[PDB]
């Protein structure tokens, strides 16, 4: 347990990067319905 | 500057529309409500746009018990008054001097106190957009400026990237010097316009940066991460599905709350909204349905509405 | 017991995932169903015309 | 300066007049612009007249 | 201390004007950079 | 009694079904919930009825966070267990010794304490129905009866009117004598069965009398007035609309609260419920949507469900 | 202002009678939709 | 003023009536609309068959 | 009486056994009665197997 | 006072039995009334 002040920014940046990669990956086009 | 007009840039969107693609389209921040609410809209004309909306919201703290609002809009002039319960009058007037230049004045009044009165002039150009607004403007005997004044400038450096700044002047009482801050904003548009990224290094070290993607004509998704001593920020993931019959909007927040907003168009006029949210950090839910009735009062308008 | 603690935590996480999936899918599933039904109705109306 | 006092008084008077007559302002613009010109009582009420 | 807050506000406005000029001329600078490489 | 069997009466409904036409059909008392709730039902067989229901209710104080319940039913035997969050087990078993005679035992247990354990034998005859139930039965060293015992008798005096009584024995600890009361119940059925009236002069001067009407095959309405020192009673007006696609139930209470309950059958399996109420005496609203998923796990059952 | 203990019973009985009459009157059949 | 009191009370009663009517009618109106639409669809399906 | 003690002990033991084994009781009756006899893990989980 | 509460309970049960007999025989009494008028 550290919960350093920088941990919040590191976590938010990590989630932002992961979400951007997920959104721009083929997985999001797959998520859109075919019909 | 003839030789330096060869680049032929495109005008970037205004400063307030920087996050429109995400904050106001693929998120529930503006559409969310709680408890029941019936919204009756009356349309009286089409060419010169006129409308007379009504509201009946119960169980929502943010919303009022009743709210009468008449919206008038034509080619170059847009006005809207909004009476509310407790005689809290709100109003907005937009006048476009030129096609690309518009001056907007908002005014909200509650129990005889004009709490909000902001006048702003918006100037859009071939490559840059600049708008200046003055919140609660006034003058004092000592002669110095009073109230809050904000000026923002956005210039397109390249067709796919625009940079700008937002200058803020705020003075509360006028006795003490008015703190002034500057905010930096960036907007990147993909060559294909498939995805749009925008970053905002707001004042006080605040960083509101978002991303937007258009998966298809129906599905568009975006992400927004906010940051604000110790920081207090949240990351939001959102998506929206628009069809000929309904509009869906979902969002998973970093705080843990999961929300959705379904608007079924049972009829061309009547639309039944559903808006439910969950708060997994405290395990409580806030859900509210509603209504949206769009009934005309003129034979021509009804004929147009039915096709 | 630590095993019991893991059991309850893993069950609560499963409940949270199921509830979130339901909340974010049921309206979306209803929208998909409505759009598909409208498409089928339009197809039937075109078949009638032709 | 004198111009500042003029601006202040103009702001006060326009605020006072708008607070009471803004919604009537929009309603008048609407009902005048529309070729049908519906009566005031029907225009206010949320019922279709046609 | 009104002296330090007026000076800081004026310097903030001056820096804002500087970056405003920077952004106004940025298309030209990017054009020059593109020519260079 | 040959000569006195010539009247040929019809068996009146059991005592608990006295108000079924109104309390449990044209009112929301039993169907109402709050906040979201997803109800997943699994069907494994049809001839011998079996099912495995699930529940996910959030935001409802009455409802539990999770509840697993398996219901088994065949021609003459019906059982149902119901696990709940906090390991609160509830169970009901019904066994029919004869076609018209059934013995029912309910058992609810919460954290090792069998709080509710009632065993009842129901005896239906040509003209009269009698059922006796014993709540929390047990025996004591002093030998006297313990717990609550209730016996009810209902006899059809005429084909269109049935009268009866309900005897109540209750003893809390057994040290003191157990208070006993009697309640009077009347049920009137119209010759055409268009409307049904029932009155219940319950114990402690309580009067629960209701009326029922069948406007058409789709619309049926009923009224119930309750009365209980000073009395505390409320009058309820209700109506219900049943169609091939949805079931609607409305109710205006004397306390001022207005409620509705719409169950849309979007699909033969999936049903989306809406349940909103208003409290005009305090101007607050409690609204909750939900779900009802009926998915089989056997090929034959799915074939039957799809037709 | 009396609000006598019997006022509650009188009010509940009056509402019950009025509602019964309304339910059994032609007005309720009219309320049911034609289609 | 007593006239003002009557005005506000009469307005609040109208609001209560409108809210109750909406709450008890909108689901019923949606049900009626759904049933009628299903009837029309069945009629169209029969016309196709014949 | 002795019969009262017998009834009391029977009530206690049946309560204790039921509290733990009632839901299993119904599940066993179901899974045995059904001709398909689905496996326990699929029977418990809320997913269609067919 | 156990004496008064036992007596009241027993009398309540006896009256309940009386009205039970009344309801059991009520069809016969109604038949006789119908014959009379």
From Swiss-Prot, chains A, G:
GO terms for cellular component: mitochondrial outer membrane; mitochondrial outer membrane translocase complex; mitochondrion. It is found in: Mitochondrion outer membrane. Keywords: Acetylation, Membrane, Mitochondrion, Mitochondrion outer membrane, Protein transport, Transmembrane, Transmembrane helix, Transport. It is a single-pass membrane protein. The chain crosses the membrane at residues 6-26. Residues 27-35 are mitochondrial intermembrane. It comes from the Eukaryota. GO terms for biological process: mitochondrial outer membrane translocase complex assembly; protein import into mitochondrial matrix; protein insertion into mitochondrial outer membrane. Forms part of the TOM (translocase of outer membrane) complex that consists of at least 7 different proteins (TOM5, TOM6, TOM7, TOM20, TOM22, TOM40 and TOM70). Belongs to the Tom6 family. Component of the TOM (translocase of outer membrane) receptor complex responsible for the recognition and translocation of cytosolically synthesized mitochondrial preproteins. TOM6 is involved in assembly and stability of the TOM complex. This is Mitochondrial import receptor subunit TOM6. It comes from Saccharomyces cerevisiae (strain ATCC 204508 / S288c). The gene is TOM6. The chain holds residues 27 to 61 of 61 of the full protein.
From Swiss-Prot, chains B, F:
This is Mitochondrial import receptor subunit TOM40. Belongs to the Tom40 family. It is a multi-pass membrane protein. Transmembrane segments: none annotated. Channel-forming protein essential for import of protein precursors into mitochondria. Forms part of the preprotein translocase complex of the outer mitochondrial membrane (TOM complex) which consists of at least 7 different proteins (TOM5, TOM6, TOM7, TOM20, TOM22, TOM40 and TOM70). Interacts with mitochondrial targeting sequences. Interacts with FCJ1. GO terms for molecular function: porin activity; protein transmembrane transporter activity. It is found in: Mitochondrion outer membrane. The keyword Ion transport applies. Keywords: Ion transport, Membrane, Mitochondrion, Mitochondrion outer membrane, Porin, Protein transport, Transmembrane, Transmembrane beta strand, Transport. Its main location: mitochondrion. The keyword Nuclease does not apply. GO terms for biological process: monoatomic ion transport; protein import into mitochondrial matrix; protein insertion into mitochondrial outer membrane. One of its GO terms (cellular component) is pore complex.
Swiss-Prot record, chains D, I:
It is a single-pass membrane protein. One of its GO terms (cellular component) is mitochondrion. Keywords: Membrane, Mitochondrion, Mitochondrion outer membrane, Protein transport, Transmembrane, Transmembrane helix, Transport. It is found in: Mitochondrion outer membrane. It comes from the Eukaryota. Residues 32-50 are mitochondrial intermembrane. Its main location: mitochondrion. GO terms for biological process: protein import into mitochondrial matrix; protein insertion into mitochondrial outer membrane. The chain crosses the membrane at residues 10-31. Belongs to the Tom7 family. Component of the TOM (translocase of outer membrane) receptor complex responsible for the recognition and translocation of cytosolically synthesized mitochondrial preproteins. TOM7 is involved in assembly and stability of the TOM complex. Forms part of the preprotein translocase complex of the outer mitochondrial membrane (TOM complex) which consists of at least 7 different proteins (TOM5, TOM6, TOM7, TOM20, TOM22, TOM40 and TOM70). Present with 3250 molecules/cell in log phase SD medium. This is Mitochondrial import receptor subunit TOM7. The chain holds residues 11 to 60 of 60 of the full protein.
Curated annotation (Swiss-Prot), chains E, J:
GO terms for cellular component: mitochondrial outer membrane; mitochondrial outer membrane translocase complex; mitochondrion. The keyword Transmembrane helix applies. The chain crosses the membrane at residues 15-33. It comes from the Eukaryota. Coiled coil: none annotated. GO terms for biological process: mitochondrial outer membrane translocase complex assembly; protein insertion into mitochondrial outer membrane; protein targeting to mitochondrion; protein transmembrane transport. It is a single-pass membrane protein. The keyword Membrane applies. Keywords: Membrane, Mitochondrion, Mitochondrion outer membrane, Protein transport, Signal-anchor, Transmembrane, Transmembrane helix, Transport. It is found in: Mitochondrion outer membrane. Belongs to the Tom5 family. Forms part of the TOM (translocase of outer membrane) complex that consists of at least 7 different proteins (TOM5, TOM6, TOM7, TOM20, TOM22, TOM40 and TOM70). Component of the TOM (translocase of outer membrane) receptor complex responsible for the recognition and translocation of cytosolically synthesized mitochondrial preproteins. TOM5 is involved in insertion of preproteins into the TOM40 translocation pore. This is Mitochondrial import receptor subunit TOM5. The lineage of its organism: Eukaryota, Fungi, Dikarya, Ascomycota, Saccharomycotina.
């Amino acid at each position: 347990f550290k919960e350093s002040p920088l941990y919040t920014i590191a976590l938010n940046g990590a989630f932002f990067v992961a979400g951007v990669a997920f959104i721009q990956s083929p997985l999001m086009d797959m998520l859109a319905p075919q019909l | 500057h003839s030789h330096r007009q060869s680049l032929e840039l495109v005008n970037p969107g205004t400063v307030e529309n920087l996050n429109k693609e995400v904050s106001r389209d693929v998120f529930l921040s503006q559409y969310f409500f709680t408890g029941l609410r019936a919204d009756l809209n009356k349309a009286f004309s089409m060419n010169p746009a006129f409308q007379t909306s009504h509201t009946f919201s119960i169980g929502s703290q943010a919303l009022p018990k009743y709210a009468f609002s008449a919206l008038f809009a034509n080619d170059n002039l847009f006005a809207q008054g909004n009476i509310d319960n407790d005689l809290s009058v709100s109003g907005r007037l937009n006048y476009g001097w030129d096609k690309k230049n518009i001056s907007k004045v908002n005014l909200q009044i509650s129990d005889g106190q004009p709490t909000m009165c902001q006048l702003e002039q918006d100037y859009q150009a071939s490559d840059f957009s600049v708008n200046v607004k003055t919140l609660n403007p006034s003058f004092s005997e000592k002669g110095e400026f009073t109230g809050v004044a904000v000026a923002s400038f956005l210039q397109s450096v390249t067709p796919q990237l625009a940079l700008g700044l937002e200058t803020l002047y705020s003075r509360t009482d006028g006795s003490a010097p008015g703190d002034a801050g500057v905010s930096y904003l960036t907007r990147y548009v993909s060559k294909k316009q498939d995805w749009i990224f925008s970053g905002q290094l707001q004042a006080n070290g605040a960083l509101i940066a978002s991303l937007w993607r258009k998966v298809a004509q129906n599905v568009e998704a975006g992400i927004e991460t906010t940051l604000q001593p110790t920081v207090e920020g949240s990351t939001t993931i959102g998506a929206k599905y628009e069809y000929r019959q309904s509009v869906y909007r979902g969002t998973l927040d970093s705080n843990g709350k999961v929300a959705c907003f379904l608007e079924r168009k049972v009829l061309p006029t009547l639309s039944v909204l559903f808006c439910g949210e969950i708060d997994h950090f405290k395990n409580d839910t806030k859900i509210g349905c509603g209504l949206q009735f769009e009934t005309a009062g003129n034979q021509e308008l009804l004929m147009l509405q039915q096709g | 017991s630590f095993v019991r603690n893991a059991f309850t935590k893993s069950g609560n996480l499963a409940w949270t995932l199921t509830t979130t999936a339901l909340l974010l899918g049921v309206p979306l599933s209803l929208s998909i169903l409505a759009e598909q039904q409208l498409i089928e109705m339009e197809k039937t109306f075109d078949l009638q015309s032709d | 300066d004198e111009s500042k006092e003029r601006i202040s008084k103009i702001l006060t008077l326009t605020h006072n007049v708008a607070h009471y007559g803004w919604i009537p302002f929009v309603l008048y613009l609407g009902w005048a612009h529309t070729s049908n010109r519906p009566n005031f009582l029907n225009l206010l009420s949320p019922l279709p007249s046609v | 201390e009104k002296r330090a807050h007026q000076e800081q506000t004026e310097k903030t406005l001056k820096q804002a004007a500087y970056v405003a000029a920077f952004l106004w001329v940025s298309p030209m600078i990017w054009h020059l950079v593109k020519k260079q490489w």
